[PDB]
Design brief:
- By secondary structure, this protein is mainly β.
- It has strands spanning 2-9, 18-23, 29-34, 38-43, 49-54, 60-65, 71-76, 83-88, 92-98, 103-106, 113-118, 121-126, 132-136, 151-152, 158-161, 164-167, 172-176, 187-188, 194-197, 200-203, 209-212, 219-223, 229-234, 245-250, 256-261, 266-271, 277-283, 291-298.
- It has a single domain, classed as YVTN repeat-like/Quinoprotein amine dehydrogenase (Methylamine Dehydrogenase, Chain H, 7 Propeller), CATH 2.130.10.10.
- The strands form 7 sheets. A 4-stranded antiparallel β-sheet has the order 1-28-27-26, with no helix packed on it. It has a 4-stranded antiparallel β-sheet with strand order 2-3-4-5, with no helix packed on it.
- The chain is globular, with a radius of gyration of 18 Å.
- The termini are close together.
- Bound molecules: ligand A1CVQ.
- Residues 19-20, 35, 59, 61-62, 77, 103, 147, 149, 220-222, 231-233, 235, 238, 241-242, 246, 266-269 line the site of the ligand N#CC[C@H](NC(=O)c1c[nH]c(/C=C/C(=O)N2CCCCC2)c1-c1ccc(Cl)cc1F)c1ccc(F)c(Cl)c1.
- It is found in: Cytoplasm; Nucleus; Cytoplasm, Cytoskeleton, Microtubule organizing center, Centrosome.
- A motif (DWD box 1) lies at residues 164-171.
- It comes from Homo sapiens.
């Protein structure tokens, strides 16, 4: 079950502008991006704001804190630069920026690199220097996915970009997964064995199709930390990225668990490092922007 535990809005604002969320390394603190480009730290139980920082001059679309707690990636919708890396030690400061990338993630095993996406192109950057190490794009294998996001695999040896599997070491495309949809480019299963590209589950070894999961169509997905549950929400074709529902799946067999209809448009969802909690950003109005963060205890 998901027990509603708490709800809160952007403190002292006429209209609440939370757009995205991620749990900090610190257990009871949630980081939230806003529609005006600020990063906020909230106590997720009290709903009280602790800290605010100015990151971009447009809405934050994505946040990702590093596991050690020292770094943060942000992306914005219509700012220059579009994405940035922030230090969060003593002073909150911009380390580096990724001017043309509308989406960024850290490498997974060792978080020493950033991977940014621009359209169907992946850029890989060194965290220390900020230098672009690699541009990944192959005109012969491109799928031209409209909502492409590039990502590392769990051991950082591989990248999936626009439905193409890359060997990072050699910077060579090693396989193109055939295209079944217009938008979604796919992610790696944390088990390191499978690639989830929209409704298709591919075996990484053989490149054979393992399953078709229709309910995943047009979904962004996130896994809990233990890799046992997958959350998916369907993209809509300052508007909300998602519709009013998200779905859970058993990550070990891809069997559905629950379909949760929150009856309001969803902006984001994240889970805490202990997989005890789910945070969901939902609009109380309809595109009126007045979002709340709802916190559920995961049963
Ligand atoms: N990280 C993470 C968690 C992940 N969030 C998103 O994917 C997400 C969360 N938010 C935006 C986008 C806002 C956006 O563009 N906005 C909203 C603010 C005003 C401007 C437009 C995106 C998003 C959408 C398209 C693309 Cl291809 C990639 C994106 F990251 C998620 C995973 C499973 C889920 F069940 C849910 Cl509800 C969210």
């Amino acid at each position: 079950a998901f027990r509603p535990i708490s709800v809160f809005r952007e403190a002292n604002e006429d209209e609440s502008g939370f757009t995205c969320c991620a749990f900090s390394a610190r257990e009871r603190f949630l980081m939230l991006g806003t529609c005006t480009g600020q990063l906020k730290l909230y106590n997720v139980f009290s709903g009280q704001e602790e800290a605010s920082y100015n990151c971009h001059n447009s809405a934050i679309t994505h946040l990702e804190p590093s596991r050690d707690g020292s770094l943060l990636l942000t992306s914005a919708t219509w700012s220059q630069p579009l994405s940035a890396l922030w230090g969060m030690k003593s002073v909150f400061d911009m380390k580096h920026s990724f001017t043309e990338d509308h989406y960024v993630e850290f490498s997974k095993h060792s978080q020493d690199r950033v991977i940014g996406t621009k359209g169907d192109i992946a850029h890989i950057y060194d965290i220390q220097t900020g230098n672009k190490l690699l541009t990944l794009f192959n005109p012969d294998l491109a799928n031209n996915y409209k909502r492409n996001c590039a990502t590392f695999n769990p051991t950082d040896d591989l990248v999936l970009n626009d439905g193409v599997l890359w060997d990072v070491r050699s910077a060579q495309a090693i396989h193109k997964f055939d295209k079944f949809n217009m938008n979604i480019s796919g992610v790696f299963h944390p088990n390191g064995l499978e690639v989830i590209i929209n409704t298709e589950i591919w075996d990484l070894r053989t490149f054979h199709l393992l399953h078709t999961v229709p309910a995943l169509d047009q979904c962004r997905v996130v896994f809990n930390h233990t890799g046992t549950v997958m959350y998916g929400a369907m993209l809509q074709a300052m508007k909300s990225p998602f519709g009013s529902s998200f779905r859970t799946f058993n990550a070990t067999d891809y069997k559905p668990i629950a379909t949760i209809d929150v009856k309001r448009n969803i902006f984001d969802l994240c889970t805490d490092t202990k997989d005890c909690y789910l945070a969901v950003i939902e609009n109380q109005g309809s595109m009126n922007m007045d979002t709340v963060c709802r916190l559920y205890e995961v049963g």
